[PDB]
Copies of this chain bind each other. A is one copy, B any other.
Amino acid sequence: PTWDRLASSEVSDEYPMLTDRWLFWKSVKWEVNDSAFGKMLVQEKFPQSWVQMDVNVNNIPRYTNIPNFIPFNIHQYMRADFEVKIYVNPNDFVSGWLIMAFLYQGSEMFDYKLRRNPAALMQMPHVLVNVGAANEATLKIPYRYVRPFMRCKDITEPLNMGVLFVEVLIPFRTSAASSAPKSLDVSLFVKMTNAKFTGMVDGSIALLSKPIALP
């Protein structure tokens, strides 16, 4: 008697051998020269952008290639808790701060564009990252969604549970000299905690499409 069991009679397929490990996702590079207050380094529909991080030459994501996304290829409904680690690489002669927060089903609020300001990001679940210490910081994102299961493929827009933000709380500031850097590197590791897939079909029974970006 919990409400994920009230959506699907078929039991869930749980393959922890090929899920539940830290996967690398993206690395992003922010500049000294365009790092202001409220600069958006990462603004992604999550976990859609992570799971569809692998793209074709014609730019359709394929679940087949990463052993972590192997069940997303053969099911149609899925549900899982996430954790996003952010690592920035420690350069001692600079200073700056990153704020990373997650907005549950953010993209469909009427006031979405107003909630990007980093003042508003200090009110949703967030983490702070320096360049000195406080390099790594792990967020936690439990499954919270309108329906007890998310769709894995199209027919619109599967796997859009929220929006992940990474913004500049204190601008990337450097010393005035040439041995100083022009940028740094910020790497985002993901993993799934309670992965339940249901509605096991074939592959090639549903399609993916070239993914759309947030404004």
Contacts and interface: CB of A to CB of B under 8 A. Distances in A.
Number of copies: 2
A66 interface: yes
A73 interface: yes
Nearest to A67: B74
Interface string A30-70: 00000000000000000000000000000000101111001
Interface string A62-89: 1011110010011000000000000000
A62 to B, nearest CB: 8
Say which size band chain A's interface belongs to: 10 to 19
Binding site secondary structure of chain A: loop
Nearest to A73: B64
A108 interface: no
A203 interface: yes
B202 A74 contact: no
Contacts of A13: 17-18
B17 A203 contact: no
Contact of A204 (B17, B18, B65, B74): B65
A67 B202 contact: yes
A200 interface: yes
A20 to B, nearest CB: 14
B74 A70 contact: yes
Given A70-B70, A70-B74, A65 B15 contact: no
Interface of A: 13, 15, 17-18, 62, 64-67, 70, 73-74, 200, 202-204
